[PDB]
Design a protein around this ligand. Sequence first.
Ligand SMILES: N[C@@H](CCC(=O)N[C@@H](CS)C(=O)NCC(=O)O)C(=O)O
Ligand SMILES: N[C@@H](CCC(=O)N[C@@H](CS)C(=O)NCC(=O)O)C(=O)O
Lengths: 209, 209
Amino acid sequence: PPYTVVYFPVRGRCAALRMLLADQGQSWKEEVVTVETWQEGSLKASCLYGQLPKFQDGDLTLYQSNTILRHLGRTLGLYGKDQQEAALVDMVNDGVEDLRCKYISLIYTNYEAGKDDYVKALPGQLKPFETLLSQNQGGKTFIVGDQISFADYNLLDLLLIHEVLAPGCLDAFPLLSAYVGRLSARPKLKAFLASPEYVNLPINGNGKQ
Amino acid sequence: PPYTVVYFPVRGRCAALRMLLADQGQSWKEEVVTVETWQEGSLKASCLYGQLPKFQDGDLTLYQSNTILRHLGRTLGLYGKDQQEAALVDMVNDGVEDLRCKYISLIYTNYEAGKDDYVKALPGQLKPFETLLSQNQGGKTFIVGDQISFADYNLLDLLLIHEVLAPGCLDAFPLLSAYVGRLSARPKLKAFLASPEYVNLPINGNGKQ
Ligand SMILES: N[C@@H](CCC(=O)N[C@@H](CS)C(=O)NCC(=O)O)C(=O)O
Ligand SMILES: N[C@@H](CCC(=O)N[C@@H](CS)C(=O)NCC(=O)O)C(=O)O
C-alpha cells in the first residue's frame, strides 16, 4: 500500500480487483478518468499499453487487470497454498478471462445481433466452472482449494454480470448459484457490493448489460 | 515431471512453452491430436474448456497455455527474483497474450481483408515491448530483470511469428530485433528451433502465416 486504481467510471475490468480489496479489508483511492482527460492524450500515452486500468501500489505502477489481480493475489496470500494450487488458480483465471473477452466483445461490438446466440452458447461456457467446483470436493468452499484466491473474485464478477445479461442463467448450475450466494454474503464484500461506490457504476461503458 | 503436451500438430499456443522446456534442458513427450481425432469430439468434450493444449506434469493436468507457462515458470525459477519482478513478468505476459489474441483473430477469421490494416497497426502494438527493453539495462538482457522468465519465451515467439507475418516489422525496433537474436542464439533454444520437431510444424493450423 497505498493503493490507487485509475479507471473509467465503470465496473468493467476493475470490479473483481475492487471486490478483492474490499473483502480483504484494504483501503484504496479511486481516480476516475473522464473522456476529456482520455482524449487529451498524455495519460493514455503514459500507459504501458495505452489502456486502463492503471494501478499504483506505493512506488509500484502496474497495468493489466489480471496483473493487478495476480499482484494482489501473491502479496495478500490469495494465490493457493502451494505451487500446484497456484497453477489451478491460474487455470481458473484464464478460463474466466476467456469468457470475459467474449462478454466484452458482445457488449461493445455486437450486442443487438449477437445476444441471442451468446445466451444460447452460455450454458456450454459456464459448465467448466460448475465442473471446477464439483471437482473441488463438492464445491462447498472456493474455486480452488479451501481458501479464497484472486480467481474467486474474478469468477464471482463474471457470474454476477452474466446473471444481469441472462437472468436465471445459473439455475441449471446449482454449485455456481450457491457459490455466488456464499461469496456475496461475506461481510466486507456484501457491504462493498451495496455501497454507492459500486451500485452507482454501470457494469460497462455504454450502459449495455 | 514427467511432462506431456497434448496438442494439434502446429506451433500455435505451444511454441512458447516448448521453447521454454527445450531451453531449460527439460524432456517431454508430445501427444499429437489430428484434425480427424479432434472432430470425433471425445477428447474435446473431456478438455476443461474444450480446447488444447492439455499438459501433464505427473498427476497434474493443466489447460490454458498461459497456465502451463506460469506453472513451468514458477516451478523452474523463471518468474522473477521477487514479488515485484513477478508482477512485471505478468504485465509483460498479459501484453503478449493481448497481441497474440489479435494475431490469432487475423489468421483465423479475417486474414485476406484484415492483413493490411493489422500490419499498419503493428508498430503501435510492438512499441510497448521495445520500451520495456530500453528500461531494463538498455535492453541488453531479458524482458524483466537480469534473468530469463516464461514471459521471454512467450514474447520471443510473438516476435518470431510477427516477422513471418510482416517481414521487417522489427527494423524500427533495435532492442527487440537484437533481443530476438540473442534469445535465439542460446545453445539449447537454437538447437530446438532448428529441429525437425519444430521446423516441420506449421505456425498455425489453417495454412496461413
Ligand atoms: N488487457 C487489458 C485490457 C484493458 C482494456 O481493454 N481497456 C480498454 C477498455 S476500458 C481501454 O482502456 N480503452 C481505451 C483505449 O484503448 O483508448 C486489461 O486486462 O486490463
Ligand atoms: N485460452 C486458450 C486458447 C486455446 C485455443 O484457442 N485453442 C483452440 C485453437 S488450437 C482450439 O483448441 N480449437 C479447437 C476447438 O475450439 O474446437 C489457451 O490459452 O490455451
